[PDB]
Amino acid sequence: PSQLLNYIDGNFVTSASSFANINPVNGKLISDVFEADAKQVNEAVVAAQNALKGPWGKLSVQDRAALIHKIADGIQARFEEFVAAEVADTGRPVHQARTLDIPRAIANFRTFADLAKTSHTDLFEMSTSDGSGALNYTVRKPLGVIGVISPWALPLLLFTWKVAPALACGNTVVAKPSEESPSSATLLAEVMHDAGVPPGVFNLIHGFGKDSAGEFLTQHPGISALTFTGESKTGSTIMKAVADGVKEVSFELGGKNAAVVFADADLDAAIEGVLRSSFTNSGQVCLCSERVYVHRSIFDEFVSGLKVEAERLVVGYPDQDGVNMGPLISHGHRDKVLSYYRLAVDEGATVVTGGGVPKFNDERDQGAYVQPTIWTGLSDKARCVTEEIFGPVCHISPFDDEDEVINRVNDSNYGLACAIWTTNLSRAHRVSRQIHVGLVWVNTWYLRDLRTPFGGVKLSGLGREGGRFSMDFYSDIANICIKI
Amino acid sequence: SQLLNYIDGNFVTSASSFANINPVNGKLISDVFEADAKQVNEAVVAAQNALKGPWGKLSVQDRAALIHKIADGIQARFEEFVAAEVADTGRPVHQARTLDIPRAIANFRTFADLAKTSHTDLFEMSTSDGSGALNYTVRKPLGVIGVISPWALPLLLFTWKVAPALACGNTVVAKPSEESPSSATLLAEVMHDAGVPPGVFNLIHGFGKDSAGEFLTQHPGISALTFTGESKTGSTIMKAVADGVKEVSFELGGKNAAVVFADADLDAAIEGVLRSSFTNSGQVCLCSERVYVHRSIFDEFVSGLKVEAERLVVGYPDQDGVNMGPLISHGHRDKVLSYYRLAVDEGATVVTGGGVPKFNDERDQGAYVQPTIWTGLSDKARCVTEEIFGPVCHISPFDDEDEVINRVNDSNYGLACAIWTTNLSRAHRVSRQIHVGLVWVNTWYLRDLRTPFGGVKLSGLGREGGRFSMDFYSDIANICIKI
Amino acid sequence: SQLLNYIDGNFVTSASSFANINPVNGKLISDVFEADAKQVNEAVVAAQNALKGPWGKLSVQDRAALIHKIADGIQARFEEFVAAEVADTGRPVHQARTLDIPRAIANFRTFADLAKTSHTDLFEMSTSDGSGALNYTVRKPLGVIGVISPWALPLLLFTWKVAPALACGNTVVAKPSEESPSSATLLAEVMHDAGVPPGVFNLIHGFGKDSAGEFLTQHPGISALTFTGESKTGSTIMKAVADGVKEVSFELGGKNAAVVFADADLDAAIEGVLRSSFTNSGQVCLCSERVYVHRSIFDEFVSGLKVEAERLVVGYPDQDGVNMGPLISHGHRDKVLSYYRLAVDEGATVVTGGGVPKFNDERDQGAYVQPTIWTGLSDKARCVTEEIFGPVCHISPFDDEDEVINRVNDSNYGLACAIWTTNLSRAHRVSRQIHVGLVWVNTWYLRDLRTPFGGVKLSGLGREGGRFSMDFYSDIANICIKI
Amino acid sequence: SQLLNYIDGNFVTSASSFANINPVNGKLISDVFEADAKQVNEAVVAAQNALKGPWGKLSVQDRAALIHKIADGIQARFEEFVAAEVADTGRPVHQARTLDIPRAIANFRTFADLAKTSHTDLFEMSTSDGSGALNYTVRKPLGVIGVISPWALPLLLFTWKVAPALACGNTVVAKPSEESPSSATLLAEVMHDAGVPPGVFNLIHGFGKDSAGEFLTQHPGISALTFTGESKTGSTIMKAVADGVKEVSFELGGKNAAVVFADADLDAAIEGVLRSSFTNSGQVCLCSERVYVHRSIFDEFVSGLKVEAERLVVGYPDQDGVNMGPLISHGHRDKVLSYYRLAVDEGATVVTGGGVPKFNDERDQGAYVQPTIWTGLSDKARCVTEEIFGPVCHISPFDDEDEVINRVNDSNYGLACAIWTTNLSRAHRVSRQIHVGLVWVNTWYLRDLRTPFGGVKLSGLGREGGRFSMDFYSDIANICIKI
């Protein structure tokens, strides 16, 4: 069918070997993707290094920002093509792609272009022993070549979340999208080319991780930084890989996030909110709630309500009427998720709903669908309650006391996000500050202001991105001290 | 003299002890107790528990007041700290009195003040339902901070990490260099006497591999590791903490250049390069071991620096008009001399020094070397590309501005650079093109503690100082309220 | 018993003096020397000259250190300051010990700390020739700051202006209220003893119109006039400095509302509104003279507040259990009692108070009034729209959230508002809709000195506090270097 | 043509009208309708109401998008705006195409962008009960912004105020100079076509006293008055708004100095001072009317500048290589020529110029004057101390750096200064000592829109630009939540 090429030094190029891109809706082949080899990865990095010395390196911040807005214009001009690409790779509902995924990719470019135009640095005056003084001023310069490695959860959103600030800060880029979701990134390369982005500034390499393009990229001494979103264990691997070169790193690594529903929550809103936080993108978001804590006084009503709403969810085709959930990303990921579904039963869970695979009795049975699933009855120490599944699942447990639930939320090796439901003013601020995570939402979930710091604690990450945090990470911060 | 660990509010010995040796005369100063894995665990657990005790309940203002009390404690025992630092390292008493100890005090006071005045951000946004949302950020303590520090500027560097760590409400497990354990031990006494709650500040003594340093980096209970020292050690530590994805902050030395343009105040530049090459006997990460001087003033510059270099007094720390003490250790002298010989083998001209002075007293059992200047090596020579960390510099002529910028940047390191020029445009044009974290113009190692400090390439990861320290030593959390 | 001016490093008398009267008993406390136009000129010229003296050459660190010594000086004479504030105003000794004097000290320390830690901005831009330019900003002293303060919280308000003025390196000519001259005079002594150079801080006593206050505002040698007091006086001062285009900053009182929603913690709201209505006998610009209570809890709220108001002990500043002292002066009492009468004529129900207590002792020669609560007036009544500045509130029921927001905002003033609610969305939704400079939720007059402070409409111009004071009391200069 | 008011979404005429006259040739360009007091009231009331309409409901993002569409609209009619600016003022077409119109576009885009990216502050504090509090600040629209602008840079200065006003969500009543009403009227058309809701932007035409300008300043319905123009007028306006305590922001011109040090690039400095003295025929608030040149290069500088001034082409706005058009009006020429005479009477040597060119065509009916250079005047001469606002400069020698700093600062004005020097230290040392809001080194009027812009002394009150505009055109509110 279609073919997805690498984009290296201003040219789309094939490779000696290719791999299949499979549609998870029906198991069908979508495209062949050309896997970049070590030589092609080197060529990309070298091209990126050289482009720093070319026209790109000479652009004013204003001209750079203008070109980045042109990249965003180019995505907007091919909006439905990008929607189609993202949907084909992942099975996500078309409505989700049209409202979350593709708009956020456009917004990523525009916001960081704007931040680049408006951001400034610092001036520090000091006295000296001779009485004449000195001036210290800081500047932001490009860090150099940014290696970007992104996952399949929100392919274009996460890819552009890294590529946008990288380019806004005047860096050049070598970027490796997930082998599961290569299409929109390839379309993005086309937009870059058509927008007139100079050769070598943006390079797209396809492939896998170990023994493939991903590993080749992290090991290349020519990069200045590696920014990554994906599995915690992969973060550790990458951190070791770049250590000999002391490369700058930025990791967002998923979690085992909790939602907490206090007795004073708006109960219908909380049920809807937890439905969203547990089952959005079929549970395949690092920010999803796989643990839910509900006050004992409302526990039964909450569980019954969520069961009903989960069973109301339409699981099916991306453009099907009223669809809420598509499949998992791949048969391989479904294997992991189903193994946890089995483990929960073995650990003594009550399966409130789901727990298996829907039977469609059509081509979708060859796809990688699972049921939205709710568990109760597990202890806080069960594997299914402590390890990240990354499926459309949550376990629900009662609690009695505010300090109790705070400690239970924090009793985790992860620390990415938490969502709290309460109508009480003091409770909202008092509890949120005590949760050991990078991101707290109160009475909502995954509401994003791109200027805010975003990241996690513990195994969930290293560093922050977003707003000034990205402007700092993707820049060399240099202090220049002038003796007067 | 005995130096004990300080764990959970108590001074404790260990099963193993090692020698602390004065580098001036090779004499024994103290027995130092080496923390084992069990004690390192005891320290981290104590620090974890201290976050949940009285320390964790202090307001930012009360926390800052207590930190100013630590600073008062150092000031009150000022000469004791001076003598501890001098005994360990052989540094001139005058340097200890003007740089090392006052900076330690200033580190605590500055970060205490930054903590009092610092604030975070508020972002407003609109939502679909027309009600809006607000996102605000807060800085919280990161948790337990692991601190591993080197011997170059013992108390200064130790407190450069410990002060912001405490100011941000963290607890600390700190391991000073086995070569300079004394002032950190006296700090533990000041902390105790100021009434810092047990577990908040813990001091562990020992080495790196198979010792307290390694055990600290491997401990799952810490939240960050901040480190200053050798680049290869940074790499090792970065691998060590990777499985726990710990926050890291590294300053890793370098091979720094000074550049003297033809329009420099020549006398000021000679004096400045003498300072940047030979301060603390050249044992500062920021020292200029490479110097580039415009061809038109090269001979005059080299001659002038030779004269000044040979006027330097190498002797006892309290000796009249002393300029230089010994190197930190005989082991370090072995490294440095090995480089002295390598320079000759590489075809260098030895403008001055190149050996060790002869004292005919106890100092001959110490670890002294001479201030040394080389010329005549190529840019690819090992002696011009590898960090020596001794009182040495190589001087090379250059002709063009773009040329020297490229030669300065042609390095796997990238910590600092000092530029000498009287020209306005040149200062700003050139400074911005040097690939380092820190540039000084017409000075060297002039420090405003609010500024970002750190390196690029093999010279580091991250920035500390001012708000960069307030961010690194804090959990930054975003709280989003849907209205 | 005699209060002198402090001009160019010397305490000086004047040709005329006026009486300082104790409002507890109407007795004479001291005679105060009134600065004439000639002495006001002498003060401004000395302040101009001090800018060129040792004060001008101090580093920001040395300046901050000295300001901390001023604070130390107040702390060393803490009880004398308490006695001074209490004598002039009749405020309870407990209030003076807990609010007034500690805030004056905190004012100096906080702005000293901000001076030490604050920095400015660097902007890079590209140019036609490809070489670029740098713009950087600096904060410099504005010059001579004229400070005019009121009698409400005499030392607190005086130092609220003097502390940032001095922290930013200005020199100062300051005129405290004729009603409360004592603590400002003691402050002059602290400055003197602290070694603040002559001319840096000058104290001038007197009245407003046709006296020291007027003369100061009309002097061409000042660089700014900061003022807290009556709104119409703000307008007068704004016209007075206009020909010189002087920088101005005004906080001008108001007619503040407290709002108690049906979901409020009722007991907390009652105690809260007791504080916000009767603190300092209702003589604070931030006091709530209008109160809106949801009709479901209206009767219960008014009953509870009546009981608590009637439990207030009104009396001597050192009286066991005293809660309220007198009004500042007989003349101010005349105004307040005029409003007490007007309220009755306007149809008010007097829930409690409404007159003067009968003590049958020397307090009857003082300026006491009763804490007072009204109900039953229209939103357009004079007693509900005009600032009384006494220990009084009118309470009105309301039904709807949008209704009460509009009623709060229906005012020519806009200083502060206190809102009582336990609902998360309501707190943030309502607070952002109130047209004032300052909103408190579930509290009142809780002050973080870093925050912007000021009013809208007739309640002010500009903001002070934190960075806003650092900006106002500074020349902000932009320096652009073409490279 | 005919230029109408734009009020509540409609173009409207008036009872009275006045002439718009081309200063190149004295010909009538348009009739302009003068808004009366009734119409000013209608505009302010329309602005107040528009705050409660769809404008007030827009998200910051949607508001910024709309402002970007305003900018798009000006760009889409770029040459129409150019022709309008040129017709009114006689400015060179090249200047209008490179400075005036592009800056108007950039004004809207920059403040739209700043609105999108700017945020506010979060401060945490501890309280007695140990539960804590949080203070967060928000930026809200101030309300109705009155804008009064002058004829020096008509659309640039008009949009410099209107853009941040709209970006901060205010509504606007704006009064452009009677001398240059065209581009503002075109801007009203752009707003209308972009779909800016009725009442959000209102344009009123007329004069000052007893006309639209005065009526606007006296209207109690405005929330602020921002103004650029003559110092005396700023003073008058400051008095006019005083009774309402309206927020004010003033930039008020000056008597700016250029300084040329002996180490300057002399050719660059000659070119630089040519630009700073004669750009827009010297009709910019920032122009250098005083020049100080080191004695050692004084003669060479003056001869060089004389030659370059005499090569300036004075003539038609679209003439081949024109450098200078006429002055704004015959009335302004009367003022400027009166100063030309006065300089001679004060004993000046007329190095070049001093009269009016003879064209022998329609330009003789215009308002042209010659670029003029004087020498030989005292620092106290009227022509050296009073703003002329024509294409003139006086040049005086100096000997010492501290001397020249004092001479530059010896002025009742303090807007800007340009300094020429190749020395690094001198650039930073001297710039910091000049008592003005704006310093340029080795350039002049190089603008980064994010930087603070304003003057000291009689040259202004407040700063605008970047965050300073975001603060001025907003209500800053502090919301304190007790937890």
Ligand SMILES: NC(=O)c1ccc[n+]([C@@H]2O[C@H](COP(=O)([O-])OP(=O)(O)OC[C@H]3O[C@@H](n4cnc5c(N)ncnc54)[C@H](O)[C@@H]3O)[C@@H](O)[C@H]2O)c1
């Ligand atoms: N950046 C600097 O300021 C700095 C300071 C001193 C030395 N150095 C460089 O390194 C050389 C010094 O030798 P060194 O052994 O003292 O440097 P080092 O970097 O190995 O030692 C620094 C600190 O880290 C500890 N450490 C060493 N190995 C460790 C490990 N595997 N895990 C945890 N901690 C470990 C040490 O005990 C010591 O406290 C010098 O020649 C110089 O080039 C740099």
Ligand SMILES: NC(=O)c1ccc[n+]([C@@H]2O[C@H](COP(=O)([O-])OP(=O)(O)OC[C@H]3O[C@@H](n4cnc5c(N)ncnc54)[C@H](O)[C@@H]3O)[C@@H](O)[C@H]2O)c1
């Ligand atoms: N905002 C506040 O904190 C505050 C404080 C005190 C009083 N007030 C209000 O004002 C009334 C008090 O009367 P007041 O006379 O004491 O207030 P005032 O505003 O007239 O006096 C305040 C200060 O300004 C000075 N002053 C007065 N007129 C002046 C003038 N024309 N030029 C220069 N300085 C002048 C005074 O001497 C005093 O130091 C109260 O009833 C109350 O409503 C407000």
Ligand SMILES: O=C/C=C/C=C(\O)C(=O)O
């Ligand atoms: O040996 C390296 C020196 C580091 C200096 C600092 O960290 C400092 O001065 O803050």
Ligand SMILES: O=C/C=C/C=C(\O)C(=O)O
């Ligand atoms: O005539 C006065 C100059 C005004 C310039 C500006 O306000 C600007 O360039 O922003």
Ligand code: NA
């Ligand atoms: Na796929």
Ligand code: NA
């Ligand atoms: Na030692």
Ligand code: NA
């Ligand atoms: Na009195």
Ligand code: NA
């Ligand atoms: Na005209």
